Amino acid sequence: ADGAKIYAQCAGCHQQNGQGIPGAFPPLAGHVAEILAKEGGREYLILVLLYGLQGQIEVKGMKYNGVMSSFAQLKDEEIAAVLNHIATAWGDAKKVKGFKPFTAEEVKKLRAKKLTPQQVLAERKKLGLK
């Protein structure tokens, strides 16, 4: 799976440069590292892609109160690949100490327990994120 091409096909919101849109679509560039630095952060990123997200969240001190759809129609390998793209395309993995690329089995195991977007928000909060 080619994570750059997959993301390109879903880049209308976070944008091709990953920097998002103020107020509307949170940035990925520079912010994936913040999530990865949390214990449970890797898993959280997979949950967002499999199950979507909703609710008020803060990113870089800015408020977002949107909705993101589930992308479970992506295969395990393809979700892995797009998460490696957003983890590496803008240098985020270069922060977190020693990064292991996302793998199909990580996605498979989370797909085995379907969550709602509201529960994904709950998981975000469990990371200590506001």
Side-chain angles (χ1 to χ4, degrees), residues 24-98:
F25 305 126
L28 298 178
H31 171 52
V32 169
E34 293 168 344
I35 291 167
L36 288 173
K38 300 302 196 173
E39 171 195 318
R42 278 178 88 84
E43 291 72 29
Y44 168 75
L45 293 168
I46 292 163
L47 295 174
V48 171
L49 271 291
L50 283 164
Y51 303 126
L53 186 56
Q54 68 188 34
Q56 303 163 69
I57 63 172
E58 202 172 289
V59 177
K60 301 297 175 142
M62 296 302 93
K63 135 151 257 57
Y64 299 80
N65 187 10
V67 166
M68 174 179 158
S69 179
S70 158
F71 284 78
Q73 68 268 20
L74 290 181
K75 291 166 145 259
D76 291 340
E77 280 288 32
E78 303 176 308
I79 288 172
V82 69
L83 290 175
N84 286 146
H85 176 71
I86 70 171
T88 61
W90 313 292
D92 280 80
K94 289 197 196 209
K95 292 99 150 225
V96 310
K97 236 156 212 253

